[PDB]
Subunit: 130 residues, 3 copies
Amino acid sequence: AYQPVVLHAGIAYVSGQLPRQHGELRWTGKVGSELDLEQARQAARLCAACCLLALEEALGGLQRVERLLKVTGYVASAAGFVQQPAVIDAASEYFDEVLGARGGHARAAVGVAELPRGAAVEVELIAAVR
Amino acid sequence: PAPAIVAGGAYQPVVLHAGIAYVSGQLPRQHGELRWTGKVGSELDLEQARQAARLCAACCLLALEEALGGLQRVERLLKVTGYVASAAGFVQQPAVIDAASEYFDEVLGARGGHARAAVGVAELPRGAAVEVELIAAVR
Amino acid sequence: YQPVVLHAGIAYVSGQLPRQHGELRWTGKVGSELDLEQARQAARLCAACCLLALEEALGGLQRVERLLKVTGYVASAAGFVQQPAVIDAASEYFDEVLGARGGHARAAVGVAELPRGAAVEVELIAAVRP
């Protein structure tokens, strides 16, 4: 059994989050066949929200976030789908919506073969904490 | 005498820096020999993939022990990333990587807790079923 | 997102594609569209882009203390299992430029798809200071 967030030496390691709203896995299927770019972006936004919710609940508020550091976005990708940056851009912009300047981050976005429970997107992150 | 072991890839098994240990992705090896190959859902079933993930985790802790001179210098694990070579439609990667997480718990107790990511990849080096990497805090 | 984030002596370098002066050079799946020699060239360009991003963030590579961890993703055709040979080209480029400071831990995986159809993507974490 893993933990959603680990805090150590001023760094928060946030586990991979799936696109859940209210507990329910909302976006399943391969991007590029079963999902198009706009649905996959909705999934990535939900993942980003789950990351920040886990971080907030671990810290007792987002005021203790000094800045985000690195975001990794995995997109379950059908043959020929190559717009993973546009998918994960929805997560990056959500981080900006919530955290302003503190939301800036380095990033990787890759197309994977499969994700847990058939999820379309999975997002993990590393943050600096005060 | 496997070439992959004697003079391995162009990378270090573990890098230690500023209180952090960066452990390279480990394949499911037993005594040097790759034990578990294939895509989970076509070439392996879930129980075999769990055995593979357990071996990967054991290899992670062996690399850490050999770099540190003993696991007593592990303050705690921080983050584990598990890659599972996944056949079409296989979506039980958390159950696979759970075997690695459970091995870490069995060996390290409270120091074994970690954040985690689990993803299904298309292929892994040498046809390995699972690859596990990790970041740990060290003394 | 940012190409590089520097925090508490660590540089987080975003995932880099195989570019020449900014222009994407190597696209396609390794094992079908590209052979091993072309994929090695692609990984070499990714590594060069990583070092260029680090150089502009630091104002010179003299402030790179050492590399720490490299993650290599290879867009892989069915049955292609030679990702270490591909990412070795990035690792060896790091060695050619930085000598002993170029050593790193590593992960290498075969993904289904990469941004814009790129053959290889490389991200890294480095230690920084004069």
